[PDB]
Amino acid sequence: MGHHHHHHSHMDYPSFDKFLGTENAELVYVLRHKHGQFIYVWGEEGAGKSHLLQAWVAQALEAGKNAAYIDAASMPLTDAAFEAEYLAVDQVEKLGNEEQALLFSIFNRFRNSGKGFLLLGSEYTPQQLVIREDLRTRMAYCLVYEVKP
Template structure:
């Protein structure tokens, strides 16, 4: 029997779940998820997608999931969080480049992205995924780059509603064999990071925390876990 100490649980709560398209709760983003899946499987003609939305809506999850898909298939893919490496260039076997937080790119990095886009466009094989906080034409970037960002598919990533997050948490809890009351869900949403990835990490830690203390999951138990993080 494996026993978890409180210290282990509090460390585990900081870990990030491995992103994939299958563990992304789509909500109003169903069309985007289907388009991404088709693109990764080679069933989509368009090779460029720009996604935008508020912080915590899942943009990074989607980009990392796409890159992970290719890496797990033995292909070459890059995930770049708010930066561009000048060494990235079109080469045999390069399947995907994902640029997160495009508005963070400096002038030099914007030039690199502009060049990579043109190379990918000409070759027509590699996938380019870019995310930002605003629609393309509202970004404070080079105008020629902004134009390129608007040429492909553009999707807003909609954050889940509170009801959708509660439903997702309760379904995950049911799969683990316990009931998560509405009041506990609401307390969690009020006192923790509200993005679904963070909520699921806490749910996992809460499940094991309750086993360590051999107590039902209640608001006092959740409060104890959150206060001791």
Template sequence: MRQLILDLLPDAAPSLDNFVAGSNGEVLAGLRRWLLPANEETCLYLWGDGGAGKTHLLRAIAAPYFDAASDPALRTLAEDDTRSGGRLAVDNVEALDADGQIALFNAFNRLRASGGALLAAGNEPPLRLALREDLRTRLGSGLVFRVHALSDAEKIAALAAQAAARGLRLPPEGFPYLLARAPRDMRSLAAILVALDRYSLEHQRPITLPLLREVLHNTPEA
């Protein structure tokens, strides 16, 4: 059963269109403007708590993506990534080690010289990051937005809209039950909703609380 649920969970690519903005409408609008060809800001920096959606937005711009949490030295970042006037996305900058800070500092300078752009994210605003001063200054030199996590009410509203778009009918207690027992990020919640739909159709069973409980019981990390 566990493997069946794994197979049902989709791996939809993050995009700006499938980002659930909630109270982050200004963030999303600012990012869209920053992506326009007329943009002259080298850097846009996002900060906020984990699970707020920063990684989704970084991956959504379809630029080379680097995660300092798994590569603190940014060893996979090549000079060619920053010399073509394109964009670069660097996540979890607070995790950069000394070598990684130098690498990002140099990458920023190359991007600025080539007309490129950097989308970066961290858990604190630039001036509160425990990084070298010249790097903090560069990360804070452009646009800075705080990304707020969705409230429970916003998550339920988003899930209800997605369910309605798929023609799903959940019992009234279904959404609070899902929110209380599943991973709380929207990507996981939306994926479980899709899995619930497919599982219900495959087994020819209506979506009830026992069916939802069954799906969650067999979903990893739920």
């Protein structure tokens, strides 16, 4: 249920302070629920936080299934990513060439098999980001979800 998303550009404040009991509760803050197969978010999560991405990766890992999250602005993409069934990519925009074609191939392997779980987050939009048209068309297979009421 939902199907409602309207671009309300607010929440530009970090809002954080020292906890700071040094608990392992940081893992509990990660532990969330799963969601749709192909989900693209912008703002509410994909802003260099990726905690919901890590949650989604972890809940898949618990099922004995392969899952990984990659910072597209901190870590490079590898062919090893094809081992994972659940992929999460945050800060997608800085994709260059090989990694972008690799990602494209990932999209194909997903759509071809009828499998593949993907979660992307950034600050703009999939059809507005500076990417090649071959990848951009594949970005349309991912849903756009805003957690805004």
